């Protein structure tokens, strides 16, 4: 019925009201101290007071660092902006990597704004232009004003549009009998479509038919909008939305990332602080998650050192499988987790421990129940021994071939023969490497 | 089309119990890998399991891409199969992660149901009112069937589709309302007044009867990547063919994901998953491997099959060596299908299948010589020798291919080992690794 | 391989014949366009569609020009002026093409050799989008 992925079974951190961690709840098994530390970090984010706080999730492969990051994102809720990222994603061919890191920093900071929109909506009854007396002067246009009549439910009024607003009208291909929607904030026009007051069975352009809009024309409506600081930065860097020719030609150009200057970011911060001071918008700081932080080179770490000291930077969480490894882009800088000690000093390392046999067994059981599979107890024990022998991920990813082989033989349960056949058909990394070492023609 | 190297593979050759036949649908041998590929195919056809990494490993000339093409042939239609190599990711206009994201989203299909009105009938009258510059176009179309006759209002696009493939009165045409398709079925009037302008010789079509408007439901599949490219900018439909989709932002991807979830919850659209096949996966960088590791854990992630033919080799972008050229965290997320070499009988059956596909008649002793050559040197070498032996036999003005044609083709075209021996015996005649050569005879 | 059926030649007259009871509120409602084409040893009077007439205004076709019409599409093509119609003896920038040979009505089978990359290049770019 429902499509499942690697982290579908996790609903959150699963903590008590005192911050302690129940052993098996919230889709989580084990990692009690790591879940408690992540809950403390979640409460720090919900305080909405600090800037540039950075922690590091450190542990081996298949230990649940990305699981903890997804649990943090689920416990924070959909309102808090969560920006998942890989260390390899910052290498862009359009713009420098530091600009991409700053763009993700601004993308992780959110804003909730109440916006008042002045709206002229209604069905077009008459649309008559008034021509200019000298059409070919080269300084004005062919028309001077346009009279347009709009009727809503229990209301009718006429508008005298300048040629810019009429240009926005006629680019939507507005004719007589169209319910339209003019937004006075930007001059943007939405053509809602044909009115149902006329015949609706004689068109060929699969149009929708709408009733007359309720209320009067020229309404003022309040909309709650959730944006980010990066949305404002990319809207002001590439201006679209006005009816001037720069906005309209910039609509049609191919979009391309640019190095957004500090002046534009400071001006956007000033406008956002003015929105907050009038009490019309609220700031929601969020989380930037960087999995495989070992992929960053020394320049991104150096820029991270400066960017974490900003007064608007979000909470940045990182993950790494590395031990004592050289930093990328360097030669001899051996560092823990592939992260240089200048950034490690700004970090709070959260350790993540490996699992036991019974924890692996109940993780396999929960992944089987979230995938709607029935496994026998002996087959579950063999899956647990296979997980302790080869890998946890190999035992989790062998459940679906076991289900395929079970439904092939017209069974709902997964017998020991099914998991033996799936072990024979599909190989882990260690058995494949043992085949590689004992082969001649480079298997 | 033409005969390629995998044209004989028309599927996987498996029963309803996922058991491979010894020779079926152009596939012979490799029973365990074929059974594992059938399990993978059933997992794809279930559609409820997302983001699983599958690695196909083995020596060269064994059947990894043959198994992938068998999966693709058994996959069925309206299911995506994005077969790329590891060298397409390295681009000048796209990042490695962005190219990998586009390859991931090309493999996820969306089946959309649309409601369509079909209007087939004879045209009574076309009235087209156009502006002085020809920009604004409107008008009416009086159309008719043998029961009733209606008048429709025409838009700009319908008039533009009426001007091309010029519809006169008395023409039986079909109107597809949901797609804006104008199909001139023909002419039914055959008026005596004939103009000297047109060279149209439209066939006579009988007058359509019944109702004029017929409601129907159409079903079409559009990939995810098409939806992000279309919604990314204004002229995204041009960028679907030019490929000028430079680094689509993540906001577009998030909004497209929420919109397609809303389309799934409305019953308008459904999401079908497909297979992303990556041939020569050892060519990817370590950054690509890390991005694949984190992108496999997505809801909109397809089944990823990878093929490599390398042992413990150097991983690109690093300074160490890893099994299959892939790091251990990627191999932790993958289940490895192992493909083994062939014996004499499997090579003989493959060569017989390839000769039957290429319309080449072989004798028994010629097939035995080709099997012995394929065992000794390479299966691909004998499969390439089949066609030139057929050309030699047709040059000798005989229909079938004899032993001496295969021997002549073996003498004319060299394999790897014979060329290596000829180069090593004549080392001074060739440019070495130090750029030294003796061109002069004396 | 394809079939091209064309009428080309120096033109002799351009009479946009008006219709009987020609509606109201419009000037010169055209019932059909009569075009008199001539070439070597051939001369044909053609009764064209009215909607070719604006194409007559589009390519600036006057009496004495050498024009070229495909039968299937009905699009005119002003090749140039006739060599005999070099009336402006002193100064003119017209391209005076010779009068075309053979009959006016010619239907010929032509063969075009392209590559698949040519088709990919021609299909990639917007074919006559007519936008900015």
């Amino acid at each position: 019925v429902t499509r499942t992925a690697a982290h579908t079974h996790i609903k959150g951190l699963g903590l008590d009201e005192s911050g302690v961690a129940k052993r098996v709840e919230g889709g989580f098994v084990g990692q009690i101290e790591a879940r408690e530390a992540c809950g403390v970090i979640v409460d720090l984010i919900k305080a909405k007071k600090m800037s540039g706080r950075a922690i590091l999730l450190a542990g081996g492969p298949s230990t649940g660092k990305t699981a903890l990051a997804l649990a943090i994102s689920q416990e924070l809720g959909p309102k808090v902006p969560f920006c998942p990222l890989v260390g390899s994603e910052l290498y862009s061919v359009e713009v420098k990597k530091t600009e991409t890191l700053m763009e993700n920093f601004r993308r992780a900071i959110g804003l909730r704004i109440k916006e008042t929109k002045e709206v002229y909506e209604g069905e077009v009854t008459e649309l008559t232009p008034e021509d200019a007396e000298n059409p070919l002067g080269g300084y004005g246009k062919t028309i001077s004003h346009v009279i347009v009549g709009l009727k809503s439910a229990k209301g009718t009024k006429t508008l005298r549009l300048d040629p810019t607003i009429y240009e926005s009208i006629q680019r939507e291909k507005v004719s007589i009998g169209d319910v339209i929607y003019i937004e006075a904030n930007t001059g943007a026009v939405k053509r809602v479509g044909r009115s149902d007051a006329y015949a609706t069975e004689f068109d060929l352009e699969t149009e929708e038919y709408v009733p007359l809009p309720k209320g009067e024309v020229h309404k003022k409506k309040e909309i709650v909008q959730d944006v980010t600081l990066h949305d404002l930065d990319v809207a002001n860097a590439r201006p679209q939305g006005g009816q001037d020719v720069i906005s309209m030609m910039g609509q049609l150009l191919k979009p391309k990332k640019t190095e957004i200057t500090e002046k534009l970011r400071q001006e956007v911060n000033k406008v956002v602080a003015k929105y907050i001071d009038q009490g019309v918008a609220e700031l929601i700081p969020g989380v930037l998650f960087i999995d495989e932080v070992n992929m960053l080179d020394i320049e991104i770490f150096t820029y991270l050192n400066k960017a974490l000291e900003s007064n608007i930077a979000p909470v940045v969480v990182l993950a790494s499988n590395r031990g004592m490894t050289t930093v990328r882009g360097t030669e001899d800088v051996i560092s823990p987790h592939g992260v240089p000690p200048d950034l490690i000093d700004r970090l709070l390392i959260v350790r993540t421990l490996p699992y036991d046999k019974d924890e692996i067994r109940t993780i396999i059981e929960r992944r089987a129940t979230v995938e709607r599979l029935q496994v026998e107890s002996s087959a579950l024990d063999l899956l647990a021994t296979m997980g302790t022998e080869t890998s946890l991920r190999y035992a989790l990813q062998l459940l679906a071939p076991c289900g395929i082989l079970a439904q092939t033989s017209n069974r709902k349960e997964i017998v020991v023969n099914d998991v033996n056949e799936a072990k024979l058909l599909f190989l882990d990394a260690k058995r494949s490497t043992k085949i590689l070492e004992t082969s001649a023609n480079y298997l | 089309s033409l005969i390629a190297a995998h044209s004989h593979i028309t599927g996987l050759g498996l029963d309803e119990n996922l058991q491979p036949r010894p020779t079926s649908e152009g596939m012979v041998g490799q029973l365990q890998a074929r059974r594992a590929a059938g399990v993978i195919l059933k997992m794809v056809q279930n559609g409820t399991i997302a983001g699983r990494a599958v690695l196909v490993a083995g020596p060269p000339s064994t059947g990894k891409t043959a198994l992938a093409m068998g999966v693709s042939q058994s996959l069925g239609k309206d299911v995506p199969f994005t077969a790329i190599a590891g060298s397409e990711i390295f681009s000048l206009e796209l990042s490695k992660t962005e190219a990998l994201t586009q390859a991931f989203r090309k493999s996820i299909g969306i089946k959309i149901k649309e409601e369509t009105e079909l209007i087939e009938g004879e045209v009574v009258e076309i009235q087209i009112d156009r502006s002085i510059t020809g920009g604004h176009k409107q008008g009416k179309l009086t159309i008719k069937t043998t029961d009733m006759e209606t008048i429709y209002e025409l838009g700009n696009k319908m008039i533009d589709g009426l001007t091309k493939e010029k519809v006169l009165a008395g023409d039986v045409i079909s109107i597809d309302k949901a797609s804006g398709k104008i199909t001139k079925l023909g002419r039914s009037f055959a008026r005596s007044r004939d103009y000297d302008a047109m060279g149209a010789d439209t066939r006579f079509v009988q007058c359509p009867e019944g109702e004029l408007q017929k409601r129907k439901t159409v079903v079409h599949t559009v990939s995810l990547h098409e939806i992000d490219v279309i919604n990314s900018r204004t002229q995204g439909f041009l960028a679907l063919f030019t490929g000028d989709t430079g680094e689509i932002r993540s906001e577009v991807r998030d909004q497209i994901n929420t919109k397609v979830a809303e389309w799934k919850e409305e019953g308008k659209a459904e999401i079908v998953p497909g297979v992303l096949f990556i041939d020569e996966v050892h060519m990817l960088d370590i950054e690509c491997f890390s991005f694949i590791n984190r992108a496999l854990e997505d809801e909109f992630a397809p089944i990823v099959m990878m093929a490599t033919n390398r042992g413990v080799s150097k991983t690109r972008g690093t300074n160490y060596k890893s099994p299959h050229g892939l790091p251990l965290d990627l191999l932790d997320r993958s289940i490895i299908i192992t493909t083994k070499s062939y014996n004499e009988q499997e090579i003989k059956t493959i060569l017989s299948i390839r000769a039957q596909e290429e319309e080449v008649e072989l004798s028994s002793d010629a097939l035995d010589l080709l099997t012995k050559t394929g065992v000794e040197t390479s299966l691909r070498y004998s499969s390439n020798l089949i066609s030139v032996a057929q050309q030699i036999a047709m040059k000798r003005k005989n229909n079938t291919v004899e032993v001496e044609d295969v021997k002549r083709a073996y003498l004319l075209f060299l394999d790897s080992a014979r060329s290596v021996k000829y180069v090593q015996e004549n080392e001074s005649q060739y440019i070495d690794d130090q750029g030294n050569v003796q061109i002069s005879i004396a | 391989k394809e079939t091209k059926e064309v009428y080309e030649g120096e033109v002799t007259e351009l009479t946009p014949e008006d219709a009987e009871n020609p509606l109201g509120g419009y000037g010169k409602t055209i019932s059909h366009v009569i075009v008199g084409l001539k070439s070597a040893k051939g001369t044909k009077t053609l009764r064209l569609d009215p909607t070719i007439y604006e194409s007559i205004q589009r390519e600036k076709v006057s009496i004495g020009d050498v024009i070229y019409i495909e039968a299937n599409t009905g699009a005119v093509k002003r090749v140039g002026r006739s060599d005999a119609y070099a009336t402006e003896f002193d100064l003119e920038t017209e391209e005076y093409v010779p009068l075309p040979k053979g009959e006016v009505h010619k239907k010929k089978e032509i063969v075009q050799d392209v590559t698949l990359h040519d088709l990919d290049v021609a299909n990639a770019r917007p074919q006559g989008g007519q936008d900015v």
Partner: peptide
Amino acid sequence: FVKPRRPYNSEGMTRILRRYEEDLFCTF
């Protein structure tokens, strides 16, 4: 009852009328 047709305004626009017998191009 029956809903009325949408008002069709074609003032100042050239007309191309294709009928069973003759075709007309009412231009300006």
